[PDB]
Amino acid sequence: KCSLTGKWTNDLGSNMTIGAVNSRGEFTGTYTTAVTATSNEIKESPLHGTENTINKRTQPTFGFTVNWKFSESTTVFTGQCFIDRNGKEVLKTMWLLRSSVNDIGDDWKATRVGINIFTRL
Amino acid sequence: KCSLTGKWTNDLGSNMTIGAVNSRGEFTGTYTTAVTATSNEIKESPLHGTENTINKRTQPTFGFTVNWKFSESTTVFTGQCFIDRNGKEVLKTMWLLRSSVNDIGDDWKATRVGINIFTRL
């Protein structure tokens, strides 16, 4: 089984730690990004999410939200916990980074998208 | 101030209910989608997320994860709570829908993207 609990690092150098996943699939953790678009000092930020439990897949999908403590922005990640060919666990994720814009008319420029691959620390 | 607590409906006809947002911005709720890509019967599904409180913004960002209970997939939403120039609250969101695929080699086709506009129900 691929499990979200534990420490992870991604291709940008960011780290996150995820606690126990409960029977409903709920989990919390903390996220330390290695990169930022703000001029502010990066601070560890909480994450909250769920892993899908339907049919108790060995490679479950999941999502979580990172509530940045140094920015008005929010990031959500979603992806799947895979067991790779070599037996290593790998999280394949895509994310949306939501900017705070001043007016509803600026909404069009508020959402960035990208990938991250996570492996255990 | 734009508050996430309450009942909302979006442009596809889906509804969600969001509970109280605590002092750390955390909230939970339930989501009833009007549409699905599965043949399975739609079931009410839990959501978990956070709204960003940095700088007491009247129009905060947020994200949440919907842990579908009739599918092995997961959706994450992120967006901003706006006060329309009329004065009504509107959630402008973008989402990622992560399908479950059998093999890590099929990861490339597993993520859909889209928009939803929510207003109070």
Added chain:
Amino acid sequence: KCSLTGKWTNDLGSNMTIGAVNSRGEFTGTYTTAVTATSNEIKESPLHGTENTINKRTQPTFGFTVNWKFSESTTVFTGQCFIDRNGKEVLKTMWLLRSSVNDIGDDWKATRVGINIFTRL
């Protein structure tokens, strides 16, 4: 059937003109955005794209690239030419807006995503 040739306007107030679509599905046009994230004056910009011709569908898929001439960025749009329930032609599109970054290490923050709905102008 839904056809791409003509003048269109979208939900942001932007306009585009699409020329003749040749037998290979190729087309060119010009794009005048109503909105920008730069400080530079908006300039009309050329677009180039293709319409899918497989099975000669009445509601074809398409894509095009807008080569901005007041910015170092690039936008691609992709979507489908629909005949809506009311009989009106509508382009449902999503886009990626690629910013120029100075360093490959900053690639993660360079891609924005969004939607546009077009109707004939």
Added chain:
Amino acid sequence: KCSLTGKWTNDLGSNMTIGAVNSRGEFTGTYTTAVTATSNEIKESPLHGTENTINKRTQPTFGFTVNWKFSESTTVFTGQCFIDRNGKEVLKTMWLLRSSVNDIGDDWKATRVGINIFTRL
């Protein structure tokens, strides 16, 4: 300087060839995907795009459309031509894959998103 002309391969094993880029930044080429979600045999397919000419940047942004000849779908790619830290040319791209859906009510599920990294072949 990073130029799009030449033969490339990406992380999924797909190949593409791009011809000369003219003074307006326009180019065409062909694309052989290594993967498909259809049950049709993959066929080499044309691509059409532009690279951004503003400020004649060493690492220009670009976009292009792939007009699949074995599917009713369309993919658009956008990204930046980087000189990476090994002095090698790398295309860092993100894409939108637009499915053909029968009805405008199905539009919400028609767009997939992902990444590709291309290096010279």
